[PDB]
């Protein structure tokens, strides 16, 4: 099959820089079906896909103009000249000519801004829930630049190993910045033992760790 | 305008089957090739099939992932496309892009989501994230809706019945370590407004036709 090889898996860039992203075939790919007619698309989350390039280099009818496409024989690069804050999501070649069809993997452009520090909230269980018999313990990190943090769950100051998950959103389409959740989940009866239910965040923002807590019955 | 409007997925057990439709509209559907494309967080994007015009003897052609257990086909007259599958795979699960060439490129519809799995769908309870005192940083408060033990994706949020949009973040799901979803939406208000406006989520799990809608109210 003819495979393509996208390069590279992701990328973060402020708004303006040049941005360059390959897909690569081998010397033995382009011998036994030429040098192909790739076309170019990107991905928002949730969205069909939506055509750049296609032929190699035609910008695709409605595209803006800081996008292009071009490249010879096994390389060939999609090239964004001055990238703007819409222009986060997944871009990926496809090989749609000679069959079997590939994609190539894809390459997942992040928006880089400057930092900026969570802000947090704690919400304890409802009365619903534990009528059920589950504790569900929920720590928010609102609007924050990067990606990366840390949330510890701390119950009667014990640091929890195990039993946390977290859910973060996409870039945000309107400052860039990131959510995140970080749910807690315990049996009515570990929630109704312990009093102190704290989540403690860890972010390049802060200059010290923020914590926010709550004991149980109001 | 050009649409593609997929639809036949949903839940399937493994082993069964499913047949998608897509019916095609503005456009002369019978001068153009059609495909199928599908898509998981795990494989990427995958070509699926293609059938081409009538003068070429409908020719179809198949990934060799789903040889022999799909079949595409094309009714010109009602301008629709099919795909049936047979002898389905957990590894077939994902979303499916009905797809039409123009000459040098396809355009996509907005794809449905095809789940092979052995569960049975399971509509979720909904409960508060009570905004408090503290929890609250500088006259903006946060409240929410936690929507807990799903199957499968998707479930929808809108706020006050889509007139609170503004400040609301609603996070992919997560899937538990039972085999179910899990997926909080919380909003960020002005303090004051706690007492004077009332904040509703409003939670539609359409697999199950579950439609909720839950009043958050601060903790007392």
């Known amino acids: 099959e003819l495979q393509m090889t996208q390069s590279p898996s992701s990328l973060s860039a402020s708004v303006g820089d040049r941005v360059t992203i390959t897909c690569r075939s081998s010397?033995?790919?382009?011998?036994?079906?030429?040098?192909?007619?790739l076309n170019w698309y990107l991905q928002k989350p949730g969205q069909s896909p939506k055509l750049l390039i296609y032929k190699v280099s035609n910008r695709f009818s409605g595209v803006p103009s800081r996008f292009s496409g071009s490249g010879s024989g096994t390389d060939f690069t999609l090239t964004i000249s001055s990238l703007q804050p819409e222009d986060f999501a997944v871009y990926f070649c496809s090989q749609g000519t000679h069959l079997p069809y590939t994609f190539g993997g894809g390459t997942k452009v992040e928006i880089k801004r400057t930092v900026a520090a969570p802000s947090v909230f704690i919400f304890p269980p409802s009365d619903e829930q534990l009528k059920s018999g589950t504790a569900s313990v929920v720590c928010l990190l609102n609007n924050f630049y990067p990606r990366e943090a840390k949330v510890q769950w701390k119950v009667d100051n014990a640091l929890q190993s195990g039993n946390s998950q977290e859910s973060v959103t996409e870039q945000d389409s309107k400052d860039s910045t990131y959510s995140l959740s970080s749910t807690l989940t315990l049996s009515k009866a570990d929630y109704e033992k312990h009093k102190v239910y704290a989540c403690e965040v860890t972010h390049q923002g802060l200059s010290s760790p923020v914590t926010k807590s709550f004991n149980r019955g109001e | 305008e050009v649409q593609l409007v997929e639809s036949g997925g949903g839940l399937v057990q493994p082993g069964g089957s499913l047949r998608l439709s897509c019916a095609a509209s503005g456009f002369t559907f019978s001068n153009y090739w059609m495909s199928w494309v599908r898509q998981s967080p795990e494989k990427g994007l995958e070509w699926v099939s293609e059938?081409?015009?009538?003068?070429?003897?409908?020719?179809?052609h198949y990934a060799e992932s789903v040889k022999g257990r799909f079949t595409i086909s094309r009714d010109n007259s009602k301008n629709t496309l099919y795909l049936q599958m047979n002898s389905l795979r957990a590894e077939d699960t994902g979303i499916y892009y009905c797809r039409t060439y123009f000459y040098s490129f396809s355009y996509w519809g907005q794809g449905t989501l095809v789940t092979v799995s052995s569960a049975s769908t399971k509509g979720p309870s909904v409960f508060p994230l009570a905004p408090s005192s503290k929890a609250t940083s500088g006259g903006t408060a946060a409240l929410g809706c936690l929507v807990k033990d799903y199957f499968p994706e998707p479930v929808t949020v809108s706020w006050n019945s889509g007139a609170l949009t503004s400040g609301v973040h609603t996070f992919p799901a997560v899937l538990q370590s039972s085999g179910l979803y899990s997926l909080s939406s919380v909003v960020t208000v002005p303090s004051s407004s706690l007492g004077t406006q009332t904040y509703i989520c409003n939670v539609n799990h359409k697999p199950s036709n579950t439609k909720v809608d839950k009043r958050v109210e601060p903790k007392s």
């Open positions: 010397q033995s790919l382009l011998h036994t079906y030429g040098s192909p007619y």
């Open positions: 059938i081409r015009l009538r003068s070429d003897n409908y020719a179809t």
